[PDB]
């Protein structure tokens, strides 16, 4: 189907660019991720008051920037006025596609269903084959699918009750993957998590693994025990992940 995401090699993306070492959701972290050997990056996007797709994880700029405010209620000039760490400014999605290699993977996490239209447009101009759209918000995935029905799409899951719904969401939304947090292993148990992933894969879905704490990849060799059950890992520390996967012999470089 899609040779950019369907590989025999494990895909490594940097979480918010490279948030273990550089400012999150910044243009600097993105370049740094690619140079450390990431296949690409995951970013969080919202829609600004004046209709620009901007990168930011939280619903306010309090925590990562020196200013305050809800970015949905602000314009792009007011936002390019923040410092998000190391002199970086809040980037727009267009700036991200300018910075990235034209072949580099981009996992856009839509945090704002209002952004779906603009995200689909920008994406159609910038080589969609290398884009994955994901969201915890099903209505954001649904809205995205009104504009673009071919781009690779992943459902992010943070609640146990979403899992039985996956077969129907797969059909409603033409899902390629389910994006699973490593935190599920402690919270619901390793074996339950394993069986759940096995079941999702039996539906013909691929698996993206993410986490808020890269320790959870390495403790109790959680990721090693899942070898063969994931296509993509989203790592806060790209260098550590690339080395680790090299050390297992499964991913070159």
Pick left, alpha or beta for residue 157 (phi over 0 → left; psi -120 to 50 → alpha; otherwise beta).
beta
Beta strand residue intervals within the chain, DSSP E: 11-15, 40-47, 53-55, 105-110, 131-135, 152-156, 177-181, 206-210, 232-235
User: Does 24 carry a binding-site annotation?
Assistant: no
Q: Angle between the 138-147 and 166-173 helix axes, to the nearest 10 degrees?
A: 20
Beta-bridge partners for 233? 12, 209
**Domain map (residue ranges) of the chain:** 1-253
For residue 114, give every residue at least 6 positions away whose Cβ sits within 8 Å of its Cβ, in sequence order, or none: 47, 72
Tell me which residue of 41, 82, 42 sits closest to 60, measured CA to CA: 82
Tell me which residue of 5, 6, 41 sits closest to 24, measured CA to CA: 41
Is the Cβ–Cβ distance between 201 and 231 less than 8 Å?
no
Distance CA 89, CA 37 (A): 24
User: Does 42 carry a binding-site annotation?
Assistant: yes
Pick left, alpha or beta for residue 205 (phi over 0 → left; psi -120 to 50 → alpha; otherwise beta).
beta
Is the Cβ–Cβ distance between 31 and 68 less than 8 Å?
no
Beta-bridge partners for 70? 60
Counted residue by residue, the chain has a size of 253
User: Tokens 């660019």 appear where?
Assistant: 17
Please report the sign of the dihedral spanned by the C-alpha atoms of residue 55, residue 57, residue 58, residue 62: negative
Distance CA 231, CA 211 (A): 15
Q: Quote the tokens at residue 31.
A: 């370049």
Burial code (b: 16+ CB inside 10 Å, e: under 16) for 213-230 equals: ebebbeeeebbeebeebb
Distance CA 67, CA 13 (A): 28
For residue 98, give every residue at least 6 positions away whose Cβ sits within 8 Å of its Cβ, in sequence order, or none: none
Tell me which residue of 71, 18, 14, 69 sits closest to 46, measured CA to CA: 71
Give Cα 201 to chain centroid, integer Å: 19
Alpha helices, H only, 50-161:
76-79, 93-99, 116-124, 138-147
Beta-bridge partners for 92? 54
Is the Cβ–Cβ distance between 163 and 135 less than 8 Å?
no
User: Tokens 């020196």 appear where?
Assistant: 66
User: Does 44 carry a binding-site annotation?
Assistant: yes
Rg (CA), the chain: 17
């Amino acid at each position: 189907g899609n040779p950019m995401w369907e590989r025999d090699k494990i895909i490594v993306l940097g979480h918010r660019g490279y948030m273990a070492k550089y400012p999150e959701n910044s243009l600097l972290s993105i370049r740094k991720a690619i140079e450390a050997g990431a296949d690409g990056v995951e970013i969080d996007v919202w829609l600004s008051k004046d209709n620009k797709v901007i990168l930011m994880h939280a619903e306010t700029i309090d925590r990562t920037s020196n200013l305050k405010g809800r970015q949905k209620e602000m314009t792009l000039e007011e936002l390019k006025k923040a410092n998000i760490g190391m002199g970086e400014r809040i980037p727009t999605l267009e700036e991200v596609f300018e910075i990235l290699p034209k072949d580099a993977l981009l996992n856009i996490e839509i945090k704002d269903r209002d952004a779906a239209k603009e995200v689909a447009r920008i994406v159609s101009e910038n080589n969609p084959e290398r884009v994955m759209i994901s969201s915890f918000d099903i209505e954001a995935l649904r809205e995205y699918r009104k504009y673009d029905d071919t781009t690779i799409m992943g459902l992010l899951v943070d609640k146990e009750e979403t899992v039985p719904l996956i077969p129907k969401l797969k059909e409603k939304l033409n899902l390629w993957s389910v994006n699973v947090p490593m935190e599920a292993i402690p919270i619901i148990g390793f074996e339950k998590t394993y069986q759940a992933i096995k079941w999702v894969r039996s539906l013909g879905l691929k698996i993206v693994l993410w986490t808020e704490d890269d320790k959870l990849f390495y403790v109790d060799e959680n990721l090693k025990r899942l070898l063969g059950m994931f296509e993509v890992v989203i790592a806060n520390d790209v260098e550590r992940m690339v080395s680790y996967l090299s050390s297992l012999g499964i991913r070159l470089e």
